[PDB]
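Objective 1b of the project was to move from sequence-level analysis to a structural picture of ligand recognition. The entry below was assembled by the postdoctoral researcher (A.K.) and checked by the PI before modelling. It contains the amino acid sequence of the target and the SMILES of the bound compound, chloride ion.
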Amino acid sequence: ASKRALVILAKGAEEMETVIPVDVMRRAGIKVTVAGLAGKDPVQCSRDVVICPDASLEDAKKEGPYDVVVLPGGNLGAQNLSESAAVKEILKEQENRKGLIAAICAGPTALLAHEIGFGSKVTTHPLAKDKMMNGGHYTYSENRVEKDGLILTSRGPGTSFEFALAIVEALNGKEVAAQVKAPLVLK
Amino acid sequence: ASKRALVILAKGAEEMETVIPVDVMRRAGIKVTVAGLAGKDPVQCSRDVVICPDASLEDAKKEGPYDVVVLPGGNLGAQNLSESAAVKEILKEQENRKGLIAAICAGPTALLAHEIGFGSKVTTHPLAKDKMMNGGHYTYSENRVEKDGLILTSRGPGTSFEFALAIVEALNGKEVAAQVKAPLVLK
Ligand SMILES: [Cl-]
Ligand SMILES: [Cl-]
Ligand SMILES: [Zn+2]
Ligand SMILES: [Zn+2]
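Corresponding predicted holo structure:
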């Protein structure tokens, strides 16, 4: 049976950090739902790329559970994720059921906002470190991708492929991740 | 004055190869127009990401000239670009006026279709080599990004950042490309 991914898409999300994981996960045969935080309407990303989500979050959250919940970054996208009661509930459920949570760039700061995964080793974008580390609830890493059990984090646009492939490996295994990786022409 | 980029977005385009250059060029202060080949309506990309273009190609081509014309890849996107009389005319004009043309992955095969840049050294995705090389009108390269004067090509999703930064360097210079690059957390 195919694994399922929920990608939560908010206004101001970093479009690269959204699209790269969606695409790579779909290459890995994962059923990806791109869910609009605000509703069903198109989402204006940080660099003005406009993406039409597959469903509202309100609807998509009724079709869980998901094998991974993915939080893109983008400063303003992450803030929107951080403020969302709906996101809080989704991440708490995902944590409670021992499901994977993956967050990139400023995305992990939503984990702090919703008190998720405290005690984990995590990375973020360098500019989001101080926000993430407020209170000392995580241990900081400078690895490009950091996986501490069911909390998987990464640093920025330029780590998006490694982040996505890490999600693929966690869900579908090392062999599928390698197979998906080879046609991408990664260095 | 700000440089201008036309990114031609067809059904079946590779969404990563579309979004990465758009975003990175906008970081570099380039005015990017994402133009829908088929018209103004949202475009279903190769991995089902749906992007709302800024304008139809029909409209955007009236607001030229552009400092670069960018052709994303994706097998079916590139075929759509290759079949387009409108694209043919845009690329011929761009070539005639000595403007940059940038194409990635299967995207360069549209150059062959429209008889653009013959004699250039070019790269493509490995799987698109034989198509591109039909007739021997180009010289093939395995470099991740190949720039032969005003013809700039690259290989795949995983070379999209290097491709985008090469476009930035060609338009706005090495210093701006370096400045844009550093926050991306590229390896
Ligand atoms: Cl941002
Ligand atoms: Cl493709
Ligand atoms: Zn980011
Ligand atoms: Zn491609």
